[PDB]
Design a protein around this nucleic acid. Structure first.
Ligand code: FES
Ligand SMILES: [Mg+2]
Ligand SMILES: [Mg+2]
Ligand SMILES: [Mg+2]
Ligand SMILES: [Mg+2]
Ligand SMILES: [Mg+2]
Ligand SMILES: [Mg+2]
Ligand SMILES: [Mg+2]
Ligand SMILES: [Mg+2]
Ligand SMILES: [Mg+2]
Ligand SMILES: [Mg+2]
Ligand SMILES: [Mg+2]
Ligand SMILES: [Mg+2]
Ligand SMILES: [Mg+2]
Ligand SMILES: [Mg+2]
Ligand SMILES: [Mg+2]
Ligand SMILES: [Mg+2]
Ligand SMILES: [Mg+2]
Ligand SMILES: [Mg+2]
Ligand SMILES: [Mg+2]
Ligand SMILES: [Mg+2]
Ligand SMILES: [Mg+2]
Ligand SMILES: [Mg+2]
Ligand SMILES: [Mg+2]
Ligand SMILES: [Mg+2]
Ligand SMILES: [Mg+2]
Ligand SMILES: [Mg+2]
Ligand SMILES: [Mg+2]
Ligand SMILES: [Mg+2]
Ligand SMILES: [Mg+2]
Ligand SMILES: [Mg+2]
Ligand SMILES: [Mg+2]
Lengths: 93, 120, 31, 78
RNA sequence: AUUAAACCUUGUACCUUUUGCAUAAUGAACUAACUAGAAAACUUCUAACUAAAAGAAUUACAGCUAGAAACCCCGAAACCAAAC
RNA sequence: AACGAGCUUGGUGAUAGCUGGUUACCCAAAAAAUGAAUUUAAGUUCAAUUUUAAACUUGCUAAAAAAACAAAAUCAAAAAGUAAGUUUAGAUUAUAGCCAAAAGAGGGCUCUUCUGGAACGGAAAAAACCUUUAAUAGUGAAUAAUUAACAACUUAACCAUUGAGGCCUAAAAGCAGCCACCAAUAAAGAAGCGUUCAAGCUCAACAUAAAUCAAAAUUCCAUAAUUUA
RNA sequence: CUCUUAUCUUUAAUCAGUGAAAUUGACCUUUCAGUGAAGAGGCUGAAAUAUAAUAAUAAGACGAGAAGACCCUAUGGAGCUUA
RNA sequence: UCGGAGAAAAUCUCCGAAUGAUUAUAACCUAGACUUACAAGUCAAAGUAAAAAUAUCUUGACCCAGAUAUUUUGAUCAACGGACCAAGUUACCCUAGGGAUUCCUAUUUAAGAGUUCAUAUCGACAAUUAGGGACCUCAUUGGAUCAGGACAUCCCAAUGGUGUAGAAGCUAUUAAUGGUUCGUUUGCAACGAUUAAAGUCCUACGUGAUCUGAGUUCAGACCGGAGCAAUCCAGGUCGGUUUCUAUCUAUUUACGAUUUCUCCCAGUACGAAAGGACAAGAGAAAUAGAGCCACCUUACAAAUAAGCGCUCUCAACUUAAUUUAUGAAUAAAAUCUAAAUAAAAUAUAUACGUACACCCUCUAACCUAGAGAAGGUUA
């Protein structure tokens, strides 16, 4: 229950998704020393980092491909407006 | 039963469509968020292949893809088995410092600062 | 004779049925 | 044989999601011509990785320490 | 599972066979014992020596020598020879 | 004491393309029933598939224009999404499917081609329909499909006026039959029908008032239920 | 036979002694409708239901047996006849 | 076996070839390809050589035998990937296996029939998403016993209509109540005499561990017809062996009646006569069910059991077709009402009755109680 409502509030549909309840550490030592990170959290972070790097890589490749395309199109323009040698006329040329 | 070619009119939006989904016909988004939400079992083999090519073997796990025609061409093949959502970057693209602090929201936003604290 | 239609096909017909517009007030009751 | 209320509602939901898929697929960031070659480098090096693994197959090194270590099985307290 | 053996819940015996299905169909009263994959032409793996290898006879334009690695059980109606 | 040809021993562990059986664990991959020849269709050999190892380089999808017939199977530069593919060496098994859906061909069935399937969930029970990426412990959670569904549109009570219009059946009356398609009027042509034909029972007028569809054979077979957002 | 009846003996049944046979996956072995290949004690949904014997019937367990019948197959046989 | 044409590449629709004549005589060699499981089969640049470019048109392996002086030739091997050379028959049979064991009828329509008059009784064209049944050839079902069920009703019962005067009939609705005979010739029918009627179907011929006749269908034997014979025929005929001790399930202790005829009403109502009713009422039987033994009969040449003897059998709260009364929608002095109401009216049935009802000693004997056990009786 409540999956659709949670999505509207910006939360994950399943309470076990991204949120304080799951991601926050489940315990710490009585001394206050932090506990070793949970294996699930470390794995989930690694996937998230991998997802971000793909986002950067794809954006950079597309943007470059756009900029590089412009430069090529410019060259074709200038190449067209090329003149050489001379233009004699008349009964002798 | 054979592969079908969808008429081009299907992918030409209408003015009200822009209003409903809130996407500007100019400044189009760059990256897709694609998730498989149906099974490839009982589907023709070509649909099975495109799903593997796009990386959507596991369901309900999002994959990022380029919003370019060649990628789009494959996505149109499996339009019925997936959900496409435009990736949003409220705080900009992640940098080296923020690479380890990202989180993809259900809304389609990749936030680069993830604190797990009350907004306050 | 009728030939049975696949469930999925029958489901499509069920969802594509014509829906007529309904008036707020019947014309008869109005002046 | 009529079609349930569950069955007709759920399909319409799927149709609406697919309807949105139509819209988001209508706004390509790059045109076809602009697309050419923007990812040539990555595709080239990727295959070079495939070839490198394929042609690197070879037997494994053999060591004396492995063979002579079997003698440790008869180690004792003198 | 349970506080509780049984009540409540879930669950169409097995092998072969059909077809990749049976509510088909074959076989099984049960216990103990006995009861059915065997060979090195080529290939692969491990070593010895190497333009040569092998303890005679053989092979050889990196080969040759040695080791390792393999291919079931039960069942007719019949046929023939010699006795009875 | 089983004679279409006795019995016993040996040949002999006869042969059987046929029936049956073929004994520990775990990991992995995995076809077919397409094609071809066969005294061959209860078999086998080859192709094709699959597989293991090895060598090195392009493969899959998609693929414009343009071509070969034509408004998608061949073919198929650049790309892009992706990780496979060709050759070398070795090797069996397999060669009879099943059901749903789609297009044809013969003529309901039966051939041919294309697609999918083989739940532990749902459809009642349910190999073949729908939902379902593998398989693990947990007294956590979000979800998918989900045998159920809400007959259909005006008489009211009234009034009906000739020379039988002729002619084929004496003569044929709104009116036997056929053709004119008829008479004044506030208002009426002759509608059923009556009549040998006219008997006339009296429709429309005048004259008064309102007015086409959409959930048979053993013994019925869950129980029930019209409204709480 | 209509239309069966009575009596006696055999068998039966009870007591004593002796003591087989085919058969048998396991059984804590129900009725109705459905589903299914003509098909259900065992599946689906209803229903019924203290537990064990003794003596009877034969609807069912496609009840059990025999070297029975029927069609087809094998590059399996055999008897007989010939042109 | 291969080739040509269509279907259009899976099986179907058609024609041809196992060559033929013409000829310029058409060489050798060698890149790259087609086709193809293998095998066989296609096309061909360049070079060389002959000549002075050209072959035009429309198919069988290996082995083994030959012929010439290297060169060549041998298949309706046509079952056409071809065994060097072999046919019938078996019901005397065997083994290894695989299988199986148009015409109704109900609806809709209505030209024409019915003197007149569509629908009293019927009925063309059709309509039902409607229910059942190469020239020749051809093969499970009766009976007995006991029956369960459907209703699409044969009789019995309640009704509508009529070309229903009465009596006989016809048609339709409702109803599954109990019943629905005995023989002859028969192998499927064919008849006789009766009846209120002698229904139509389903249950694996309903039912062979209940029984029985055929047939499938054989070992013997004849005719007729085939074949040289053995043998054979879906042609005749006569003869001709299937057994079972029940393990499981299931089952084995009441009922409250059907039909027919005669008498009466009454030879009346009706009807010209002929002929001839209904309801109401009384009495006889037949069959079924449940019992009994005074008589009769048959037995035990017993104190008993039987039928061929005797007796007894009934109530309906609850409905269907149909018919009335009151009365709205609907100005009626209408309308039986999937309006509110009041009644009558088949077959069914269990509301309502009858039966049962007791907690029960038992050494033993006896018993009209009984397989055992149970049960009854005991100055
Ligand atoms: S809605 Fe009833 S007449 Fe106006
Ligand atoms: Mg069988
Ligand atoms: Mg032999
Ligand atoms: Mg053998
Ligand atoms: Mg064989
Ligand atoms: Mg195929
Ligand atoms: Mg051939
Ligand atoms: Mg041959
Ligand atoms: Mg390419
Ligand atoms: Mg004894
Ligand atoms: Mg029991
Ligand atoms: Mg049943
Ligand atoms: Mg049950
Ligand atoms: Mg006993
Ligand atoms: Mg029995
Ligand atoms: Mg054969
Ligand atoms: Mg032979
Ligand atoms: Mg070849
Ligand atoms: Mg040349
Ligand atoms: Mg042959
Ligand atoms: Mg051949
Ligand atoms: Mg004989
Ligand atoms: Mg009966
Ligand atoms: Mg009836
Ligand atoms: Mg029987
Ligand atoms: Mg018996
Ligand atoms: Mg004889
Ligand atoms: Mg006889
Ligand atoms: Mg005799
Ligand atoms: Mg005989
Ligand atoms: Mg018994
Ligand atoms: Mg009377």
């Amino acid at each position: 229950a409540g999956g659709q409502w949670r999505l509207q509030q910006g939360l994950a549909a399943n309470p076990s998704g991204y949120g304080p309840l799951t991601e926050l550490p489940d315990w710490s030592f009585a001394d206050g020393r932090p506990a070793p990170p949970m294996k699930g959290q470390l794995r989930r972070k690694a996937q998230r980092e991998k997802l971000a790097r793909r986002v950067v890589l794809l954006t950079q490749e597309m943007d470059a491909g756009i900029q590089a395309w412009k430069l090529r199109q410019q060259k074709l323009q200038e190449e067209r407006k090329k003149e050489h040698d001379l233009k004699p006329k008349g009964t002798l040329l | 039963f054979t592969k079908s070619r969808i008429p081009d009119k299907v992918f030409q939006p209408k003015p009200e469509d822009h209003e409903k989904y809130g996407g500007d016909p100019q400044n189009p988004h760059k990256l897709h968020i694609v998730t498989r939400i149906r099974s490839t079992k009982r589907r023709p083999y070509w649909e099975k292949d495109t799903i593997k090519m796009l990386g959507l073997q596991k369901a309900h796990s999002p994959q990022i893809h380029k919003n370019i025609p060649s990628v789009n061409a494959k996505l149109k093949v499996v339009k019925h088995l997936i959900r496409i959502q435009p990736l949003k970057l409220p705080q900009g693209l992640p940098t080296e410092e923020t690479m380890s602090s990202t989180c993809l929201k259900s809304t389609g936003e990749l936030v680069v600062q993830w604190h797990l604290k009350p907004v306050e | 004779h009728w030939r049975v239609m696949h469930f999925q096909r029958q489901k499509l017909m069920a969802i594509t049925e014509y829906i007529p517009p309904k008036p707020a007030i019947n014309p008869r009751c109005l002046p | 044989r009529t079609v349930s209320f569950q069955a007709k509602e759920s399909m319409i939901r799927r149709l609406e999601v697919e309807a949105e898929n139509h819209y988001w697929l209508s706004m390509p960031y790059m045109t076809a011509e602009q697309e050419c070659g923007h990812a040539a480098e990555r595709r080239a090096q990727a295959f070079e990785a495939i070839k490198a693994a394929a042609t690197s197959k070879f037997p494994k090194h053999r060591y004396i320490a492995d063979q002579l270590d079997h003698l440790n099985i008869s180690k004792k307290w003198s």
